[model samples]
Target: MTYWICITNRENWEVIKRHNVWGVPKKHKNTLSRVKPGDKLVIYVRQEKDKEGNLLEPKIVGIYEVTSEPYVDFSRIFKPGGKETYPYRVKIKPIKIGEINFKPLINDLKFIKNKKRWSMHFFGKAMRELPEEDYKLIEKLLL
Candidate 1:
């Protein structure tokens, strides 16, 4: 099965867990279209401010298995941001759930060649392919 990393902020992560679904804007339709049932998705929570206004560390929060093909849904599910309803979606089922620091794993992650400027790798990606070895490495630490 193919592996992927689903990127999101803390608030949206909560929504994902609650609804058991992952979604992205229409612009990401092509990428989302590539996802298929039985594929695995590693949940990547981007660093962001907490309710107290303190910065939180980015984290690898969980791994999920895709249960449905990508479909369109304009309903409001995730935390609303601008005009994005993240209409393109796929059903997911959580398999492993854990939290681990992301920065420390960046240097060793195969997908990130430029270690110093790693954010660029995930900058605009809602979801991206992850090599199996890289997924295993993160899985090891997460376990």
Candidate 2:
């Protein structure tokens, strides 16, 4: 099964935990279409930063497995403060939970081929695929 790194914030992560579902919007149609049941999903909480541009470390919160085909959920259980409507949804079951700083592990992650542009993969994004080995490594630390 494919492995995915789902980028979200601290608030939405709480929603996912409360409900066993993951949701995105219409814009991610092309990408989310590729995901299927049994895929591994790792939750990556985006790094928080101060107004002055100082960085707050991002965290790898947990791993989950997609349990159902991607479907539409008109219910707005996602990003309450955000503009986008996260109608696209998929059911998932948690596999593990923990925290890992994203910046420090850049060089060691296989999918991050360019250590310098590693963050680009997640720039203005929802989720990205991870090599199985890389997923295993991240899962090991979080578990």
Candidate 3:
């Protein structure tokens, strides 16, 4: 099965875990098209800036197994900023649910090719793919 990373804020992360579903913007049809049943997903929360401008660490909050293929989601399940979040959704079931600080894992994450600019990996993504080894490594660390 393929591996994936889905980014969201802490609030939405709770909704996803509670509801066991995730979505991407409707515009990302091409991206969602890649997922299939049985694929694994890793949750990446965006780094928040403190009042003084320091970037807080992002975390991997949970892991889920894709339970359905992408389908249109007319109902809104995500509430963040003013951005459209009507990502074509797929049902997901949590395999693991908890938080793991991501900074310590960055150097070992192959997906973060540039440790100094690791955030680039998540720059414009709502959801993206991860290498099997990277997923496994993160999976092992999370559990």
Candidate 4:
């Protein structure tokens, strides 16, 4: 099965935990279409500012298995403060829950070709495939 790391914020991560589903906007259909049942999904919570403006660290929070085919869902249960409508979705079941600091792993992650600008790899994307080695590296730390 293919392995993927899904990029999301802390808030939406909570929603995924509660609902067992992952969603992305319409424009991501091309990528989302490739996801299928039994695929492994890693949750990557991107860095964000807190209420008091403190910088929060990015984290790898959980590992899950996709359980349903991608489908359209208009119901909203994500990013309550944002205008994004992540309509394309797939159901998932969590297999593990843990946190790993994302910054330090940049130097070691294979998918990150440009170590100096590693975050760019995650920018403007919902999720990306991970090489088996990279998935195993993250799985070892998270499990």
Candidate 5:
């Protein structure tokens, strides 16, 4: 099975950190710890963008999957209306591994500190469907 990993920018990381919702190591521990043979891993990143469609700093928004199940458990650290309330949602979709090339929707890439770890922040946006060809490429990576 292939899993999706999202990479974010510094600004977004601040929002997540302030709400105590960043660094979800536990979520990946169970799935990533025990990788079986032939298991494929695919990573997709969403670049941040501005209203005018211009790229901005902290270019990355979040990473997601094309086929894996969506895991939206933020209860452990997120508190509604807290300092970490964000206005966007991230979606994951599969793209052909090695065939699809991804770039940040925006050009801004900022880094921040999260509990002694450094993370990047990207622009926030919604998810969209992948092209049929890209989807087919990603399908090969599925477990």
Candidate 6:
């Protein structure tokens, strides 16, 4: 079966930044799972708006595809062990939307013990090291 991962909207940029996401670049090609000749993987963003047509938030930030047997491990994509990192315990699953079901993925940090405290510390260090403009952009997105 095919699969896709969805991230929170642009309004949640601060939350993602707080989680250490450097930016919303296209999904990492190297991080994709098994691929067949005809299979495709895509990543895109959607905006959420209010009744008055004001920009409310961003809806999705990430997407993926399952092109072969055994889906790829999400940890590899979100928290690949290395000198650089955007560590988080994310979860992937399938969900029904109307008549069809789609895969839904998110950081599983919520299930990790002491995740709140851990994230707080992580954010502190990340914010300190992030560039000033990037930090401000994330802050505005969240606001």
**lDDT per model vs. reference:** 0.91, 0.86, 0.86, 0.92, 0.34, 0.30
**Residue lDDT tens for model 6, 1-143:** 22222233344433433433222222333223232322222222344676788974323333222223323223323331243233322222211111111112112322213543433423312111223443233323323
lDDT for position 6 in model 4? 97
lDDT of 1 by residue, 1-143 (tens): 89999899888999999999999987788999999999999999998987899999998999999999999888888776286889999999999999998988888899998898898899888999999999899878877
Candidate 5: Cα lDDT at 89? 29
In terms of lDDT, the best-performing candidate is: 4
Error of 5 at 54 (Å): 2.9
Report the Cα lDDT for candidate 5: 0.34
The better-scoring model by lDDT among 5 and 6 is 5
User: Which residues of candidate 2, in runs, are more than 4 Å off?
Assistant: 49-55, 80-82
TM-score of each candidate? 0.96, 0.90, 0.90, 0.96, 0.25, 0.21
lDDT (Cα, tens digit) per residue for candidate 3, span 42-135: 9988878777999877889989999998888767677864967666889999899888998899898888899998878888788889999899
Please give the distance, in angstroms, between residue 24's alpha carbon in candidate 2 and its true position after superposition.
1.1
lDDT (Cα, tens digit) per residue for candidate 2, span 28-131: 86678888999999998887876798986787999999999988878867775557767888899999888888887888899888898777778777888999
Candidate 4 off by > 4 Å: 80-82
**Would you give me the overall lDDT of model 1?**
0.91
| Residue 112, candidate 2: C-alpha displacement in angstroms | 0.9
Between 2 and 6, whose lDDT is larger?
A: 2
TM-score of 5: 0.25
Candidate 5 error regions (>4 Å): 1-24, 49-53, 56-135, 139-143
How many clashes in candidate 5? 26
> Between the candidate structures 2 and 4, which one is better when assessed by TM-score?
4
Model 6 clashing residue pairs (backbone): 9-58, 9-59, 10-58, 89-107, 89-108, 89-109, 90-107, 90-108, 91-106
